[PDB]
Design an enzyme around this catalytic site. Sequence first.
Site, PDB file in Angstrom:
ATOM      1  N   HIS A 195       0.720  -0.684   0.041  1.00  0.00           N
ATOM      2  CA  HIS A 195       0.152  -0.120  -0.457  1.00  0.00           C
ATOM      3  C   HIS A 195       1.245   0.998  -0.173  1.00  0.00           C
ATOM      4  O   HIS A 195       2.050   0.511   0.782  1.00  0.00           O
ATOM      5  CB  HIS A 195      -1.330  -0.506   1.350  1.00  0.00           C
ATOM      6  CG  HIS A 195      -2.173   1.427   1.424  1.00  0.00           C
ATOM      7  ND1 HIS A 195      -2.963   1.634  -0.122  1.00  0.00           N
ATOM      8  CD2 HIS A 195      -2.159   2.488   2.001  1.00  0.00           C
ATOM      9  CE1 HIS A 195      -3.402   2.459   0.279  1.00  0.00           C
ATOM     10  NE2 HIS A 195      -3.304   2.587   2.040  1.00  0.00           N
TER      11      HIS A 195
HETATM   12  C1  LIG Z   1       5.060   8.886   7.604  1.00  0.00           C
HETATM   13  C2  LIG Z   1       3.999   7.284   7.852  1.00  0.00           C
HETATM   14  C3  LIG Z   1       3.984   6.875   7.135  1.00  0.00           C
HETATM   15  C4  LIG Z   1       4.146   5.460   6.184  1.00  0.00           C
HETATM   16  N1  LIG Z   1       3.868   5.003   5.520  1.00  0.00           N
HETATM   17  C5  LIG Z   1       3.198   3.495   4.843  1.00  0.00           C
HETATM   18  C6  LIG Z   1       3.191   3.078   3.994  1.00  0.00           C
HETATM   19  O1  LIG Z   1       3.364   3.834   2.692  1.00  0.00           O
HETATM   20  N2  LIG Z   1       2.507   2.321   3.489  1.00  0.00           N
HETATM   21  C7  LIG Z   1       1.693   1.731   4.880  1.00  0.00           C
HETATM   22  O2  LIG Z   1       1.188   0.581   4.065  1.00  0.00           O
HETATM   23  N3  LIG Z   1       2.122   1.829   5.983  1.00  0.00           N
HETATM   24  C8  LIG Z   1       2.460   3.105   6.219  1.00  0.00           C
HETATM   25  N4  LIG Z   1       2.860   4.001   7.650  1.00  0.00           N
HETATM   26  C9  LIG Z   1       2.127   2.931   8.842  1.00  0.00           C
HETATM   27  C10 LIG Z   1       1.226   2.644   8.571  1.00  0.00           C
HETATM   28  O3  LIG Z   1       0.653   3.882   8.816  1.00  0.00           O
HETATM   29  C11 LIG Z   1       0.416   1.903  10.185  1.00  0.00           C
HETATM   30  O4  LIG Z   1       1.068   1.229  10.155  1.00  0.00           O
HETATM   31  C12 LIG Z   1      -1.020   1.974  10.241  1.00  0.00           C
HETATM   32  O5  LIG Z   1      -2.224   3.060   9.955  1.00  0.00           O
HETATM   33  C13 LIG Z   1      -1.598   1.020  11.656  1.00  0.00           C
HETATM   34  O6  LIG Z   1      -2.660   1.145  11.317  1.00  0.00           O
HETATM   35  P1  LIG Z   1      -3.209   0.925  13.419  1.00  0.00           P
HETATM   36  O7  LIG Z   1      -4.174   0.153  12.920  1.00  0.00           O
HETATM   37  O8  LIG Z   1      -2.578   0.146  13.993  1.00  0.00           O
HETATM   38  O9  LIG Z   1      -3.088   2.039  14.008  1.00  0.00           O
HETATM   39  P2  LIG Z   1      -3.612   3.863  12.944  1.00  0.00           P
HETATM   40  O10 LIG Z   1      -4.039   4.023  11.904  1.00  0.00           O
HETATM   41  O11 LIG Z   1      -2.456   4.779  13.636  1.00  0.00           O
HETATM   42  O12 LIG Z   1      -4.653   4.124  13.934  1.00  0.00           O
HETATM   43  C14 LIG Z   1      -4.079   4.613  15.590  1.00  0.00           C
HETATM   44  C15 LIG Z   1      -5.835   4.730  15.963  1.00  0.00           C
HETATM   45  O13 LIG Z   1      -5.610   4.977  17.289  1.00  0.00           O
HETATM   46  C16 LIG Z   1      -6.032   6.228  18.070  1.00  0.00           C
HETATM   47  N5  LIG Z   1      -5.988   6.593  19.275  1.00  0.00           N
HETATM   48  C17 LIG Z   1      -4.425   6.444  20.104  1.00  0.00           C
HETATM   49  N6  LIG Z   1      -5.258   5.754  20.953  1.00  0.00           N
HETATM   50  C18 LIG Z   1      -6.346   6.583  21.534  1.00  0.00           C
HETATM   51  C19 LIG Z   1      -6.957   6.479  22.482  1.00  0.00           C
HETATM   52  N7  LIG Z   1      -6.359   5.821  23.260  1.00  0.00           N
HETATM   53  N8  LIG Z   1      -8.278   6.621  22.498  1.00  0.00           N
HETATM   54  C20 LIG Z   1      -8.842   7.306  21.348  1.00  0.00           C
HETATM   55  N9  LIG Z   1      -8.029   6.970  19.646  1.00  0.00           N
HETATM   56  C21 LIG Z   1      -6.768   6.593  20.207  1.00  0.00           C
HETATM   57  C22 LIG Z   1      -5.144   7.425  16.965  1.00  0.00           C
HETATM   58  O14 LIG Z   1      -5.859   8.713  16.913  1.00  0.00           O
HETATM   59  C23 LIG Z   1      -5.018   7.030  15.605  1.00  0.00           C
HETATM   60  O15 LIG Z   1      -6.451   7.150  14.400  1.00  0.00           O
HETATM   61  C24 LIG Z   1       3.192   4.551   7.276  1.00  0.00           C
HETATM   62  C25 LIG Z   1       3.535   5.627   8.633  1.00  0.00           C
HETATM   63  C26 LIG Z   1       3.564   6.851   8.342  1.00  0.00           C
HETATM   64  C27 LIG Z   1       3.612   7.885  10.406  1.00  0.00           C
END
Ligand SMILES: Cc1cc2nc3c(=O)[nH]c(=O)nc-3n(C[C@H](O)[C@H](O)[C@H](O)COP(=O)(O)OP(=O)(O)OC[C@H]3O[C@@H](n4cnc5c(N)ncnc54)[C@H](O)[C@@H]3O)c2cc1C
Lengths: 483, 485
Positions: B459
């Site tokens: 992605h």
């Molecule tokens: C700059 C950057 C570039 C990236 N590029 C890529 C890429 O090109 N391809 C790829 O596959 N991945 C990429 N990633 C990594 C990817 O974004 C993450 O692996 C993915 O978002 C993880 O999903 P998640 O469900 O673990 O958490 P997230 O999308 O991180 O969701 C976390 C949610 O929890 C919320 N939150 C936290 N604590 C609390 C709480 N206690 N109460 C309420 N809300 C809370 C946050 O606000 C958030 O919106 C990138 C990351 C970054 C920072």
Amino acid sequence: IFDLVVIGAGSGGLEAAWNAATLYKKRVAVIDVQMVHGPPFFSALGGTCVNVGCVPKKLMVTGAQYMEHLRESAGFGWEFDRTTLRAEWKNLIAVKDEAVLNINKSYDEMFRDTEGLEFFLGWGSLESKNVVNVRESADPASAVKERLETEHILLASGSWPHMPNIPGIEHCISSNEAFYLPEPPRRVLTVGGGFISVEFAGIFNAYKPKDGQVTLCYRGEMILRGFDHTLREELTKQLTANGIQILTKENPAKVELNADGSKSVTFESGKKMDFDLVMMAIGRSPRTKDLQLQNAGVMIKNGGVQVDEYSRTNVSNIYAIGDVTNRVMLTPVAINEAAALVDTVFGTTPRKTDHTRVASAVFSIPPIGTCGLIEEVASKRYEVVAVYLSSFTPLMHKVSGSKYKTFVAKIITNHSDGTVLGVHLLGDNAPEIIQGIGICLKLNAKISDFYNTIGVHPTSAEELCSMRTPSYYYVKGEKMEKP
Amino acid sequence: SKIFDLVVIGAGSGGLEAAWNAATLYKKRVAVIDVQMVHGPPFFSALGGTCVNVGCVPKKLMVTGAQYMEHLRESAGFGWEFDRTTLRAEWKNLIAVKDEAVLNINKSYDEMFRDTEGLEFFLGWGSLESKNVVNVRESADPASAVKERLETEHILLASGSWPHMPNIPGIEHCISSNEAFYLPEPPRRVLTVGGGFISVEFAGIFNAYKPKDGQVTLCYRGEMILRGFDHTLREELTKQLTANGIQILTKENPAKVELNADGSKSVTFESGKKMDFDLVMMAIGRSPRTKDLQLQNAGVMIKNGGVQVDEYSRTNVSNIYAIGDVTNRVMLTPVAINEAAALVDTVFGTTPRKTDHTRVASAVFSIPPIGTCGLIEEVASKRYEVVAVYLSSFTPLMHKVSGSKYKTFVAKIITNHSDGTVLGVHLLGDNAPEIIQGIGICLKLNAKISDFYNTIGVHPTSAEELCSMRTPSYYYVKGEKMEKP
Ligand SMILES: Cc1cc2nc3c(=O)[nH]c(=O)nc-3n(C[C@H](O)[C@H](O)[C@H](O)COP(=O)(O)OP(=O)(O)OC[C@H]3O[C@@H](n4cnc5c(N)ncnc54)[C@H](O)[C@@H]3O)c2cc1C
Ligand SMILES: Cc1cc2nc3c(=O)[nH]c(=O)nc-3n(C[C@H](O)[C@H](O)[C@H](O)COP(=O)(O)OP(=O)(O)OC[C@H]3O[C@@H](n4cnc5c(N)ncnc54)[C@H](O)[C@@H]3O)c2cc1C
């Protein structure tokens, strides 16, 4: 009153919530701190990827590749008054903002229209094994906005940038604020050697002012540890060929702001240099602290929540997926784990994510695509390993003027049976080429399967079907060659 | 006993592969014949063949050049600004750097001949005097001077194909793709006749380099361009080419071409419709070059235009073989190369080898491009009782912001629904040629649709969409389209 509460409405959270309410018609609530992207908390509904990750990153890297196209068009006969060329950073930030906003809005409608799926704005934390509170701030003494009793909890809070405790770290930003900068820095230091540092170095290099300079520094000896060393070496040469300065074995000791508002950075070595912006892209940590995991006895191990291979933690009511588990921090892996958890819980058959052979990309200019093992871990796990390496300047780059753009293709096999253990690519479109290759490794392809396939001509990808003879081998870890 | 082990007529994609392998792997003395040393008029092709000289390699450079018109327009949606009134495409520079690029490959094949013992190049027109003597003459005329008489134990016919010009009055006022590579400056009004890939690719080239009040028109006598490709990709590509300024005249068929006093050509179509163009290019098809070979001196059979061969590329006459475009099987350079290597292994090696011509991936470098591997549904539904079609089309976010919101990405997977085996994958959109190569390896592996959606995607890319298709859009049961209720 609820069947599932998801703390975190991001890549994994929203996937599990939807997949549960729709496929298994069980009722779920999801919590997140913001509706729309941006400061104060940056991440919002949609998660890190939508708001401050993959999606805005990809728009910006595409915008940055136009410096390449516009320069290279000249080799094919396109002339224009090149002295009028201007890159306009706020037009890019404005279109990025609109693109992200529409995805936030989209997610809002999804809640307003899918029955059994409820969004709660605020900070979720564990009151006990079966009660989640939606408070109004990260501080566990703020007004409890909602109290949710549930039959199951999923933690999907993600990760957050790690800022080092050095003098002057308040004059530094993370990647989060880099998405909202009002105008492009003239001298920017990007600290770190991972993909976020490398990608933003390319983005800033393209939109920098007339006398701008981008410096990337890493404390180790070569950028991108964990990647193939040929790719690391070659990408370093192409990034320095495009005007980025790379300072390896250098690490900031202190940052103090000068009179101008600029920052003087003193490196551990004694080196001192001034920049207008300093971005720390040193690492990301699971954000566990505000969850109040101790109130239900959820066990964390190395910074992230300890989960077994089916994403269950040690309290049977609570599960965790995504970045907070600190396994593979990629959106597709979080989405995969989320579907596998909702199946093992509310479905009949337990599914677990395979974390090996996941293809991924680095959107540097030129990009990297990679799937599988690098030879350093392959030779540790296998007795004889074959390395097939091909590197060539694509003909379009002989004609475009960018003669330094070497395409590198490298396949690594278990030479005892021919199984492809990894494929690593550097060059244009390598992220697009590696997706099909990820399917091949999941099908346990052998190198004969690659070279018995007929190539699509002319493409870069057909090189992978033309590698028939190893360049060298690793026998019991020793590099050896046929004479 | 007598002298060569193999004489190869045609130094092109398959001929040079066969010649090289026999001389180096098998140590055979090989002679290779071709009509020119370097590309260009009069004979166009030369050492290296059609792909190198007037095929794949020059047209991909010209399509990459054309693609910059897209880049330069789309850069504005990401904030790049320049004085767009100073923008011009300089056709002469494009032809000059293409000529140098092709010349350098012509020069290295020459060097290759100087450097390999047992590999000899003969400049001239080759033809059979009998089944074990090949004559090299000064011209295509069977009575011109014999320049060399080559005795041999084996002959390989690798002469390729040539533009097929229709016999319509005025055809001598039209050019083929061969001359299109050497045009002095770009046509203002150009008509490309044909609905196949060469006509569609050059329409895109001419459209990007056209002058000020330039217009490119494509006409095809049938219903829609790219007969033989997936129907959604055909409809969609017509939409996107039209959206970029190319006028497509389908169900129009030229009756005659005549030269107007000023030099323009006037084309009257069979419908009475009549139009003027400055250049008319015929790209209606390509035919095996068998005429000059004098095949009757050895008794070699021809069936429907090409030299008849079995699966191992053997003709009806022992010790005479044919590969590549002259056999009229799949006219693609990698196919000719594969056949050449299989043939030299069968003949000089210990194990007989044949090329698999099914599941060959290929691309059309239109703007936007097509990447395709396997069966299209109309033939799959006639060979399989139940066929599932997974279809996904979406605008890449990049094009939602670049301005080209008509650039829909279309991904289509068709399977044998009884066991989930993927039978064909068809893609339209940016980078689809690069995406289809890995998919070609998957079809050779007999991948199932579950193996596609159980792979984790990379992605954000267009290709990860191929890993997101879990549910059929519709089905074909005994040829009729059915859907789940
Ligand atoms: C700059 C950057 C570039 C990236 N590029 C890529 C890429 O090109 N391809 C790829 O596959 N991945 C990429 N990633 C990594 C990817 O974004 C993450 O692996 C993915 O978002 C993880 O999903 P998640 O469900 O673990 O958490 P997230 O999308 O991180 O969701 C976390 C949610 O929890 C919320 N939150 C936290 N604590 C609390 C709480 N206690 N109460 C309420 N809300 C809370 C946050 O606000 C958030 O919106 C990138 C990351 C970054 C920072
Ligand atoms: C405009 C165009 C675009 C193309 N694009 C693609 C593409 O992108 N990808 C792809 O895979 N394929 C493409 N092709 C097709 C590809 O070029 C051919 O399939 C391939 O060249 C066939 O190889 P061959 O060995 O059969 O013959 P060729 O490469 O055609 O070699 C034939 C040689 O024989 C010579 N010759 C002929 N008769 C005699 C004789 N009597 N004596 C001596 N020499 C003789 C010639 O001069 C010639 O150079 C394209 C073709 C065209 C014309």
